[PDB]
Design a protein around this ligand. Sequence first.
Ligand SMILES: Cc1cc2nc3c(=O)[nH]c(=O)nc-3n(C[C@H](O)[C@H](O)[C@H](O)COP(=O)(O)OP(=O)(O)OC[C@H]3O[C@@H](n4cnc5c(N)ncnc54)[C@H](O)[C@@H]3O)c2cc1C
Ligand SMILES: NC(=O)c1ccc[n+]([C@@H]2O[C@H](COP(=O)([O-])OP(=O)(O)OC[C@H]3O[C@@H](n4cnc5c(N)ncnc54)[C@H](OP(=O)(O)O)[C@@H]3O)[C@@H](O)[C@H]2O)c1
Length: 530
Amino acid sequence: PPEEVDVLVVGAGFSGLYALYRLRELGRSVHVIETAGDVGGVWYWNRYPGARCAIESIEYCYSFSEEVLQEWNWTERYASQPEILRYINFVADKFDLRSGITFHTTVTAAAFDEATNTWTVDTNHGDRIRARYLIMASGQLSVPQLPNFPGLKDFAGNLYHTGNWPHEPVDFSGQRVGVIGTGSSGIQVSPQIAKQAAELFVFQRTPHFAVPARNAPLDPEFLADLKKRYAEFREESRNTPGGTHRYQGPKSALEVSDEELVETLERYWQEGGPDILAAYRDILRDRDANERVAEFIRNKIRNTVRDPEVAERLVPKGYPFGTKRLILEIDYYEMFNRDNVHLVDTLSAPIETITPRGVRTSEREYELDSLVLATGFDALTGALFKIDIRGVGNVALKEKWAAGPRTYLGLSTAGFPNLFFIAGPGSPSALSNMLVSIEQHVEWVTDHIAYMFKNGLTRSEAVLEKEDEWVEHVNEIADETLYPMTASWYTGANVPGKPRVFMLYVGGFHRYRQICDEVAAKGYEGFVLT
Ligand SMILES: Cc1cc2nc3c(=O)[nH]c(=O)nc-3n(C[C@H](O)[C@H](O)[C@H](O)COP(=O)(O)OP(=O)(O)OC[C@H]3O[C@@H](n4cnc5c(N)ncnc54)[C@H](O)[C@@H]3O)c2cc1C
Ligand SMILES: NC(=O)c1ccc[n+]([C@@H]2O[C@H](COP(=O)([O-])OP(=O)(O)OC[C@H]3O[C@@H](n4cnc5c(N)ncnc54)[C@H](OP(=O)(O)O)[C@@H]3O)[C@@H](O)[C@H]2O)c1
């Protein structure tokens, strides 16, 4: 890795690879540092069986390259992780991206030097790079989180986390296997494992809402047709709250009769996918509205499993539909109908400790040959906090953000000039199709950088007052929805001791992009440039 560079980029997943590509195109020196052996980010790390995207392949893809759009052939309604990894390798090879990337290398600290207006960045290999701009493309869901209980290191069997899955197939044949966590990771990994294991124990805490994916082959007519209008189709997706073609249902879940509700929701349930989140305009705004939808979903869940005792344990309760990430399930509910699959309800009987033989609840011991941790991620701030980042006056990012992330547009933080966060806290981030949130942040940041070199500036900084205004705005629009009142990773609720604040912008990607454009249009209002 070079000793000096215009822009250093941390992370080689979607965000990082695009930042590299566009920056070269703008004629800036740029280099990328990445912990992993190769490119991919989440689709490199998350190789557990059943790993699949929950945005339709034709939406969840880059649009910066008409060539890539014309050449790539997706195959399924929802792409499996290995296909998305092939796609990302395709794009990397096409634009020759690896010559710009150092792999196997973890950034450990970065400190801003006020005299030079530059960042000096250090790695666990002892490299030191001096860069004018520092782009953290280091992910949202990139640091695995272990669950909160002892005896983990004592377990005699094999121990896995889904976000750090082995690079070659793991064989569960004839095993007694435990999965802890039933987020989308656990929901995807579990039916795969149940095919091999002599017995599978699924350790559920709060149940998550899941609806049928109804995956299907992609019609190759449809692909070829779509391509003729691809750039147009994408543009429609950029002009939405969600970054996809999801239908924005006009009515209120409350204005309709029961019969019309069932019938409309029945159509979504048969169709499959996440679009039901926008069946009515107020599902995420009004608790009575939300509840009518949630109830319809709970009953479909009940009717999915024959033992009604086991079915009632699968019904999510205590939090509004859609306020933890919606999950797309494939034969997950069906799975509890098998002899060798066991739902362990750890709300009724909490896990007390892992033992050398298995798992202890307050009710009994569970002997196991392997334990799979589907326990999620220290989300949104996790990766940043693992790095000793220091701004003006030696302030640690970790400390300034200790009560929750403070940003302007989520893009930068006051006190830390020349530093940009891709698709993180204070922006749409994971509340969209992330390829659309990711391209828009990469273009805005890399445009900002180009504008800086153009007009002769060397220092970009969020104005503290606008940040404070932005933080309060994010919180106040979040408080008009039901989002903040549920314990989700959006809220930091899954890391012990982490401050409970809703971390994402909820006003929709479209409106967020309009605001960013007005900002850059006025020469970057809310930034101070010198
Ligand atoms: C299992 C899973 C499924 C998902 N499914 C969807 C989906 O269906 N729809 C959707 O819109 N989004 C989904 N997401 C969200 C996902 O975060 C984004 O879609 C997108 O892949 C994020 O890309 P990225 O480049 O920003 O971050 P990442 O892909 O996470 O890349 C960050 C990279 O930075 C590296 N890194 C972090 N810190 C350092 C450091 N200190 N030094 C060097 N390298 C570092 C990591 O190794 C990683 O490779 C999913 C995420 C996960 C984990
Ligand atoms: N496209 C996809 O289908 C897909 C697949 C995987 C991941 N993702 C992305 O990644 C996000 C995270 O998914 P995820 O399933 O990995 O993690 P998650 O949504 O954060 O779920 C973690 C799970 O582990 C359980 N858990 C956590 N801590 C525990 C503890 N201390 N004791 C007992 N149980 C514990 C949680 O229970 P509680 O809920 O009760 O806390 C939850 O069931 C998703 O929401 C999505 O954004 C997407």
